Nucleic acid binder design. Structure first.
Ligand SMILES: O=C(CCCOc1cccc(Br)c1)N[C@H]1CCSC1=O
Ligand SMILES: O=C(CCCOc1cccc(Br)c1)N[C@H]1CCSC1=O
Lengths: 241, 298, 238, 298
DNA sequence: CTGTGCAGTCTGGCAGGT
DNA sequence: ACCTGCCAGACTGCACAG
């Protein structure tokens, strides 16, 4: 097993260093240490929810200058960003280019203005369906093709362990509308998602129509919703069914 | 070519001064900035500074000197140039600073270096060791040497008490000094050197492996390296240390005495390194090495 | 330089000129046999049909054991696939993990699948993929587990992307094609609101929104808008 | 004792016979069932038989002969002892069997065998190579030698196009032959020996390494190995093959032709081989080896 | 291509018990 | 925890005019 060493040895070492840390700022601090050691100035870990369909909120932490974070949270460049949306298209890492952000150029002009010109971003869909992205950035020295695969594997290991522990530490970042449907309400919401109306679901369950109606009311108030389409869509999105 | 061994320019912002077997490495940090690396031995002083005048308009543009080791290999040049340079921070490991502060160690280092001189030269005026312009560095300290230089110091213990290694993050360069050992001039494979601890040495090489793939591996003996071998230099030195462990343990089990292997290994290796290290101390040094190997790591 | 990075670059290069599924699984078979384990498998839990989540699968096991899945349909009951739904780490095969459904473990031990691993991963288009590997002896040590983790996660990434390129029948869900306005109106109504409120905010009459709703109804073969919204959320296409 | 070398009661169920350098191993796999392994060289036949009568009460009791590959150094004893062992049965890979059935690559074998016969030694009556009893065995076939031992055949190619190794799960020994390659007793480290395919050889060693921790290890030269060297013997072969590849590519970069390296390896390493290899042919063996490594490495 | 249609099944929301 | 009827509400698969 001590034959290749190398990258596997790095992964074991980073896991050992990461494990006993329990403060989230400590986790980001060690990640910041690691991404400095690869030769990139700055990093940024972002999480795209899918809770609000019309305006999907995207919660982000990282180390870019604070007024640029303010530029995000005021002008709301998160949704218009295609680096985040690349995860929805495919699970490929993507280096940054002027060609890549042809859809939205104001972001690129602001970034190249503001001390970020070279960088890359690795998406990943967390198991709970919250598309997450890990971005890294520097000023000069465009990424070489010789470099790219090592950054790819190391960023994937980093984001895997990172989202694992951020799930473990129940960060504000990933907490959804916390809902815990037990078995029968999970089943009935699932069946409603399958489009069977109340009568069909009732007769196959042989349960009274107004009883299942009241169960729909319980599910309604649980999500604070006016219509079952919200219940079905959100239950599908968050994986409750 | 792989061992970019000649003096002069090596890479866009890296030059080799003096003799390759005990190099004195120089970094172009900017427009009016310089920074020596890896130090040197005492005999080469009038050589090394005489090469510095070729690559530097005037000596004041130096700002930082990186030193990686306690031994005579690389501390020897320090007192004989620091009066010339108006200012330079001798960045070195925290435990090495106490080594310079002590009066005991300087006796060994200065006498050993003075043994290496040619029959003619006497050194120029040089300040006492205690007045060195020194600033310690701990593990992981981010040496912002310049706009284009973000070096991380890693404490690679085991080859000595204190041996640190400097790693440029941006170009994936790494000045390891003697931590990787000594790159063999002829036969190519790495050559282990452990003189004060064994168990820590493998830990240091593990951390060196944990650093990402290395474009340019740089020991303190034999000049710069590039390419495939420099990438897995960290793995190969670890593996060679295990190979020498196997050699010593097999010989001990076979019952041949300890020093006979030391004499044979001295005969094998000392020839390429004769010009900085008289053989009588070479034998004792590698005797100590094999003593540590026999003691530890069965 | 040898080693892992040069084992990943060469594998990607060997993967690039392929244009058929048999070549993909052939190189998977060669590489997993290089790794050490005997058999492989690639499963896909789709989330599309909610009442009966259909599971596709392809590998090299006994053909009759694949037939055992088709006759008895242990796709839903498999904990190995189900761990992908909850978490993302690799799960190592053991009696404790299958303790919920020991019948599967009993047949698996009987059919000579004693030891293995099973890495899940969420495919980019919201559709659970998993790649598993197995052998007959040599229970996985903690020393080999992480090497298995890295390799079984470089091949599942590349292979899921690769079959997504070849439009393999396993990965792709039913074809979906929505206009920007169709997607937009379905996204707006996916949040629970009456069609009238939608008509007010879009500044278009109720007839048009009902018309587009009827179009999505005919597209998804739906009996109710809830089905359309649910499948839309599941496929990640709004 | 880490390497049991002399012949005799090597173990409770095993006994080495013949010269230690090119040995034949007897397996005491039952009160009424023994077996042979690694069928050696032709010249030692009248030794081996003279040794075998120390153990066997009657030679007919022997059943199974195990053979590793088609090279002359391990298959010399078959035509000289197989007719006189009437109940013998020879096991080997099918690619060995095709080679033996072929007229070609046999006259060379008997010539090289003859070419080692210390002085006037007419051999005994020899049968033709095709007629002797063989039942070839494929990869992974479980072998019911007897109630106790259940060996396993692993398709360990690379030292030759037909090489296989024989593993037992019960007591965790492994008749390697030359899959790992020769063992250097003087230097205590393994010897690479590749003659067809590097790329198959390394993955064969990986398949060897993934086996359990070996309690014992029997290469085709140097006798049985015991203890710590049994475990990481798989790892050390991998190590040494990459080491010698590094040496070849390094000297090629320097500019030395392979001919210098072949002479260097010969003078450094032929001391073990002087008894049972022509020196001139050993040089050609290193030439073929290093040419194959030059082609296939990186 | 899209506004307007009543007719009509689908179904939020307690009233009142189980 | 899971039960049986109503009162309109918010619409449902086609309607064909705009
Ligand atoms: O996608 C990402 C990661 C998510 C956003 O990162 C940010 C942005 C502002 C403040 C902080 Br802290 C992090 N970065 C890329 C998109 C545009 S440029 C860039 O850095
Ligand atoms: O589905 C899996 C992993 C892949 C199994 O391989 C196959 C083989 C044929 C059809 C299917 Br579906 C899967 N289950 C695991 C846990 C219990 S047994 C096993 O292999």
């Amino acid at each position: 097993m001590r034959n290749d060493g190398g990258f596997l040895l790095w992964w074991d070492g980073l896991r050992s260093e990461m494990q006993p840390i329990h403060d989230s700022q400590g986790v980001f601090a060690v990640l910041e240490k690691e991404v400095r050691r690869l030769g990139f100035d700055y990093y940024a870990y972002g999480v795209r929810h899918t809770i609000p369909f019309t305006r999907p909120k995207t919660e982000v932490h990282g180390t870019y200058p604070k007024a640029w974070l303010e530029r995000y949270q005021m002008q709301n460049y998160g949704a218009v960003d295609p680096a985040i949306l690349n995860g929805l298209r495919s699970s490929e890492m993507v280096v940054w280019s002027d060609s890549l952000f042809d859809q939205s150029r104001m972001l690129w002009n602001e970034a190249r203005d503001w001390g970020l010109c070279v960088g890359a971003t690795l998406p990943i869909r967390a198991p709970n369906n919250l598309l997450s992205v890990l971005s890294v950035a520097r000023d000069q020295q465009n990424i070489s093709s010789f470099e790219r695969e090592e950054i790819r594997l190391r960023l994937r290991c980093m984001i895997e362990l990172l989202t694992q522990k951020l799930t473990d530490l129940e960060h504000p970042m990933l907490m959804s509308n916390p809902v815990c449907l037990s078995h029968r309400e999970r089943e009935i919401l699932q069946w409603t998602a399958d489009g069977k109306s109340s009568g069909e679901i009732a007769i196959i369950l042989s349960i009274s129509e107004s009883t299942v109606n009241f169960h729909h009311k319980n599910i309604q108030k649980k999500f604070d919703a006016p219509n079952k389409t919200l219940a079905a869509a959100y239950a599908a999105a968050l994986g409750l069914i | 070519m792989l061992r970019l061994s000649a003096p002069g320019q090596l890479d866009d912002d890296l030059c080799l001064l003096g003799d390759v077997q005990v190099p004195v490495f120089l970094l172009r940090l900017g427009e009016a900035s310089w920074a020596l690396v890896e130090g040197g031995i005492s005999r080469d002083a009038e050589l090394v500074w005489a090469d510095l005048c070729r690559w530097v308009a005037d000596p004041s543009q130096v700002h930082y000197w990186l030193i990686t080791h306690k031994h005579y290999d690389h501390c020897g040049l320090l007192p004989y140039l620091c009066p010339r340079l108006p200012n330079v921070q001798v960045l070195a490991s925290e435990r090495t600073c106490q080594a310079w502060k002590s009066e005991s160690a300087v006796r060994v280092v200065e006498r050993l270096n003075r043994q290496l001189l040619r029959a003619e030269q006497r050194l120029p005026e040089a300040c006492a060791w205690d007045a060195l312009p020194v600033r310690a560095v701990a593990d992981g300290e981010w040496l912002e040497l310049g706009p284009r230089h973000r070096l991380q110091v890693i404490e690679a213990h085991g080859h000595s008490d204190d041996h640190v290694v400097f790693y440029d993050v941006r170009r994936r360069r790494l000045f390891c000094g003697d931590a990787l050992g000594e790159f063999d001039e002829a036969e190519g494979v790495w050559r282990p050197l452990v003189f004060d601890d064994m168990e820590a040495y493998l830990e240091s090489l593990e951390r060196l492996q944990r650093l990402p793939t290395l474009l340019q591996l740089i020991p303190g003996h034999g000049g710069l390296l590039r390419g495939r071998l420099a990438a897995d230099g960290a793995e190969s030195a670890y593996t060679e240390c295990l190979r020498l462990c196997r050699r010593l343990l097999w010989r001990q089990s076979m019952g041949e005495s300890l020093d006979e292997l030391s004499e044979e290994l001295h005969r094998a290796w000392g020839g390429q390194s004769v010009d900085f290290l008289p053989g009588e101390l070479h034998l004792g040094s590698m005797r100590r090495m094999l003593e540590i190997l026999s003691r530890q790591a069965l």
